[model samples]
Target: MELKNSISDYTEAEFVQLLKEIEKENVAATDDVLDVLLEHFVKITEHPDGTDLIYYPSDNRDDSPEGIVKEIKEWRAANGKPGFKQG
Candidate 1:
C-alpha cells in the first residue's frame, strides 16, 4: 500500500514495509512526508528489548523523525544524490 495523508491512515504493516522500501532504495523525501514514514518506522521497528533495527544516529539532535529527515538530507548531499518527490 502507498502512504496516506495521515500516518494513522496506514496500517502498521504497510508503514513498516514502506520503511524497508526506503532503506532498500536509500532515498530521501520532503520533511512533511518523511515524518509520517519515520514515525511508524521508529515505532514498528523498535525492539521490545530496547534496541533499534534502524540505525538512527546516537547524537540525533531531535530524537524524532525530523532528525532522521535531517540525516537523509545530509547523506544525500554528501553522496551527491537528489531527494525524492513525494508520491
Candidate 2:
C-alpha cells in the first residue's frame, strides 16, 4: 500500500478522536484496522479521483494501528504533517 500522508487534510481533533477510538478498540484491533487502512491508502494512490478499489501490498507495510497512532502524534508534533510515505 502507498504510504502517502493525509495529515494536512486531517484536523488535530479528528486525529485525536480516532486515536481514542483505536485505544478503545484495543491492541488486537490493529490487525483488522490496518487492512482497511492499507486498502484506502492504496486506492487513494492508484485513483486519486476515488474510482478504484486497490490491492494489498505484496509486502506487508508492517502497519499496526497502535504504531500508526503513535507515529502520527509524534510526527504531527515534530513534523506537523502526517504525510504518508513508504513505511
Candidate 3:
C-alpha cells in the first residue's frame, strides 16, 4: 500500500495538535512553517490576479513568526490599519 501524508490533509484542529507536539519536542517550527508558507506565497504570486506578498522590506526580512508579525504591524501602522493582537 502506498502512504502519503501532507499538511493539506490536516484539519485546523489537527494542525494545531501537530504544532503543539512539534513544540513539545522542541523542533524548529519556523523552518518547517516557512516551507509551507513559501509554498503558498509562490502559488499566490503565480495567480492571475495575485500580487506579490511583500511581507518584508528589502533590507529587513525575517522568517520567525514574531519577526514577521512585527513587520506586519509596521506595515499596518504605516497604512493606518488596526494592529493585531500579540501574545
Candidate 4:
C-alpha cells in the first residue's frame, strides 16, 4: 500500500486500496468526499485503537473523518479548492 503527497498523484486502484485500509479502521466519511481533504493530508498516524490523519495548515490530529469532511472543505476553499463541489 502507498500514500502519496497528493490525491491526484495516485492511480485509481491505489486510491481504492487506500480507502479499504482507512475503512478497516472504522473511519467515518458520511459524505464520501473526505478524499478531497485527504488530497492535502501529509501524514497518517495509525494505532491499535484508531488512526490520526494529519493534514496541512494546522498539523492537528483530526482523527474523526465526518468531523473533518465538514470542516476541511472550508479550508479547501481557502486553499483554492471548490469547497462544496463534490468530486
- Top-TM-score candidate index: 1
By summed lDDT, which 10 consecutive residues of candidate 1 come out lowest?
Answer: 44-53
TM-score (all chains, Cα) for each model: 0.35, 0.32, 0.33, 0.31
Q: Is candidate 1 or candidate 3 better by lDDT?
A: 1
Sequence-dependent TM-score of model 4: 0.31
For candidate 4, write residues 6-87 as lDDT tens digits: 5345444454456555555336645354554344343321111122333232345344444444344444446664333224
Q: Candidate 4: where are CA atoms >4 Å away? A: 27-87
The window of 10 residues in a row where model 2 has the poorest summed lDDT is: 49-58
Q: What value does the lDDT take at residue 30 in candidate 2?
A: 57
lDDT sort, best first? 1, 4, 2, 3
Each candidate: RMSD: 13.3, 10.5, 10.4, 10.8
Write candidate 1's Cα lDDT for 1-87 as tens digits.
465554334444454467566564446554565555556555533333222434545564655444544554455457655443343
Candidate 2 — which residues are off by over 4 angstroms?
A: 1-5, 27-31, 34-87
lDDT of 4: 0.42
Report the Cα lDDT for candidate 3. Answer: 0.40
Query: Candidate 2 on 16-83: residue-level lDDT in tens?
Result: 45445434544563558745554544443333322122222113333444444444445345744444
Return the top candidate by lDDT. Answer: 1
| Of candidates 3 and 2, the better by lDDT | 2
